[PDB]
């Protein structure tokens, strides 16, 4: 058994998660980390991202863990010419373009690029397509959370007087139920999710801050909001985590008979589950290349069995 040689590009939250999780794999060897920074807090060999071309023959798959916002769009295609790549790119409106670009790079180099893996895009995208394909006439919605929202948290932190803050996006239990019954067709995004804020500020600024939040356009205006002014000690203790998750609910009618399909994710640590998904798809990319395949693919184009470290025969005999 020849293990798959993998490397990590970008050492942030995701990068640390995949590094830590590769040890739990029976068929993978971490060759090193390609970073823009020289000094990293790890015993794993660190290399300059500029020297990827010099290790092209020591690596089978590159786990791209840089920022989706800017890094991915411009850097990703370059790495596809050196080995199979796996990213968790999440800009939905840019995925078709990303795929086309990654496909040209991967095809030319003869590698396989797995784009937009993770839980969303990723696992949620898969369930969305499966549930919609099965239930011809259907209604579908995806709720996010309970979970930390980085975008909304930043809006909170930029309010004058806020020392520390975090906001959790929580799906409205009322909206979830309606969706399960198939009566959520007419619900706005303003009523499917609730917003919970935890702010650390001087008691004298509480009245204003609370009002700034409730009237903040786009972010909180029109939503059910709940503000909590906690002690710094309480914040550091129970609000320095990265939890997340969500629900993908699909309902359908088969002639006077309703069917509900619900996929739920409860993650204690977002980067850990994302890394787990990315890794599994890393195994799939390698396998696909072996089978003579090349190009860029989404999670919708890989047969399920490809992500598993077990042989197909064991899977069919035990899990089908």
Ligand X SMILES: NC(=O)C1=CN([C@@H]2O[C@H](COP(=O)(O)OP(=O)(O)OC[C@H]3O[C@@H](n4cnc5c(N)ncnc54)[C@H](OP(=O)(O)O)[C@@H]3O)[C@@H](O)[C@H]2O)C=CC1
User: For residues 119-158, which are near ligand X according to CB under 6 A?
Assistant: 119-122
Task: Give the nearer residue to ligand X in terms of CB position, either 37 or 78.
Answer: 37
250 in a known ligand binding site: no
Out of 25, 68, 172, 298, point to the residue binding ligand X (CB under 6 A): 68
Q: Which of 15, 245, 282, 295 binds ligand X (CB under 6 A)?
A: 15
Task: Say whether 111 counts as a known binding-site residue.
Answer: no
Q: Find the shortest distance in angstroms from Cβ 197 to ligand X.
A: 21
* Distance, CA of 197 to CA of 226 (rounded, Å): 6
**84 with 112: CB under 8 angstroms?**
yes
Query: Is 66 flagged in the annotation as binding?
Result: yes
Adjacent-strand bridge partners of 227: 197
145 is annotated as contributing to ligand binding: no
- Closest C-alpha among 103, 102, 109, 101 to residue 82: 109
255 is in an annotated binding site: no
Query: Based on CB atoms, which residue is closest to ligand X, 68 or 142?
Result: 68
Candidate ranges 8-16, 140-148, 152-160, 228-236; the one touching ligand X (CB under 6 A): 8-16
Count of residues touching ligand X (by CB under 6 A):
24
Does 35 contact ligand X by CB under 6 A?
Answer: yes
Residue 120 marked in a binding site? yes
Residue 309 corresponds to which tokens in the numbers above?
Answer: 């470290």
In SS3 terms, the chain reads as CCCEEEEEECCCHHHHHHHHHHCCCCCEEEEEEEECCCCCCCCCCEEEHHHHHHCCCCCCEEEECCCCCCHHHHHHHHHCCCCEEECCCCCHHHHHHHHHHHHHHHHHHCCEEECCCCECCEHHHHHHHHHHHHCCCEEEEEEECCEECHHHHHHHHCCCCCCEEEEEEEECHHHHHHHHHCCCCCCCHHHHEEEEEEEECCHHHHHHHHHHHHCCCCCCCCCCEEEEECCHHHHHHHCCCCCEEEEEEEEEECCCCEEEEEEEEEECCHHHHHHHHHHHHHHHHHHHHHCCCCEEECHHHCCHHHHCCCCHHHHHHHHC
* Smallest distance from ligand X to CB 210, Å: 30
Q: How far is the CB of 46 from ligand X (least distance, A)?
A: 9
Contacts to ligand X from residues 256-295, by CB under 6 A: 270-271, 274
Report the candidate in 87, 13, 7, 4 with the shortest Cα–Cα distance to residue 48. 7
Q: How far is the CB of 148 from ligand X (least distance, A)?
A: 11
* Residue 285 C-beta: closest distance to ligand X, Å: 16
Window contacting ligand X (CB under 6 A); options: 4-12, 19-27, 290-298, 308-316: 4-12
CB of 10 to ligand X, least distance (A): 2
* Contact mark string toward ligand X, 107..126, x via CB under 6 A: -----------xxxxx----
Q: How many residues does the chain have?
A: 320
Closest approach, Cβ 1 to ligand X, in A, equals 30
Binding residues: 11-14, 35-37, 65-68, 88-90, 117-121, 144, 150-151, 169, 195, 244, 270
Residues that bind ligand X (CB under 6 A): 10-15, 35-37, 49, 65-68, 88, 90, 118-122, 270-271, 274
Binding residues for NADP(+): 11-14, 35-37, 65-68, 88-90, 117-121
């Amino acid at each position: 058994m020849t293990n798959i040689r993998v490397a990590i590009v970008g050492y942030g939250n995701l990068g640390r998660s995949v590094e830590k999780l590769i040890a739990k794999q029976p068929d993978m060897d971490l060759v090193g980390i390609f970073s823009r920074r020289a000094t990293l807090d790890t015993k794993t060999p660190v290399f300059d991202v500029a020297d990827v071309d010099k290790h092209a023959d020591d690596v089978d798959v590159l786990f791209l863990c840089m920022g989706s916002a800017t890094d991915i769009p411009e850097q990703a295609p370059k790495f596809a010419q050196f080995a199979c790549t796996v990213d968790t790119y999440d800009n939905h409106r840019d995925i078709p373009r990303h795929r086309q670009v990654m496909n040209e790079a991967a095809t030319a180099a003869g590698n396989v690029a797995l784009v937009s893996t993770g839980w969303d895009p990723g696992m949620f995208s898969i369930n969305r397509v499966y549930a919609a394909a099965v239930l011809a006439e259907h209604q579908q919605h995806t709720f996010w959370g309970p979970g930390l929202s980085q975008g909304h948290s930043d809006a909170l932190r930029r309010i004058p007087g806020v020392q520390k803050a975090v906001q959790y996006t929580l799906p409205s239990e009322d909206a979830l139920e309606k969706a399960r019954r198939g009566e959520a067709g007419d619900l706005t995004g303003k009523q499917t999710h609730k917003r919970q804020c935890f702010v650390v500020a001087d008691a004298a600024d509480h009245e204003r801050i609370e009002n700034d939040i409730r009237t903040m356009p786009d972010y909180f205006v029109g939503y059910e909001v709940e503000v909590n002014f906690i002690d710094e000690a309480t914040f550091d203790s129970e609000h320095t985590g990265m939890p997340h998750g969500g629900h993908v609910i699909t309902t359908g009618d088969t002639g006077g008979f309703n069917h509900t399909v619900e996929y739920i994710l409860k993650l204690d640590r977002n980067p850990d589950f994302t890394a787990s998904s990315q890794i599994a798809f890393g195994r799939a990319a390698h396998r696909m290349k072996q089978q003579g395949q090349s190009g860029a693919f989404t999670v919708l184009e890989v047969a399920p069995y490809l992500l598993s470290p077990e042989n197909l025969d064991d899977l069919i005999a035990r899990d089908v």
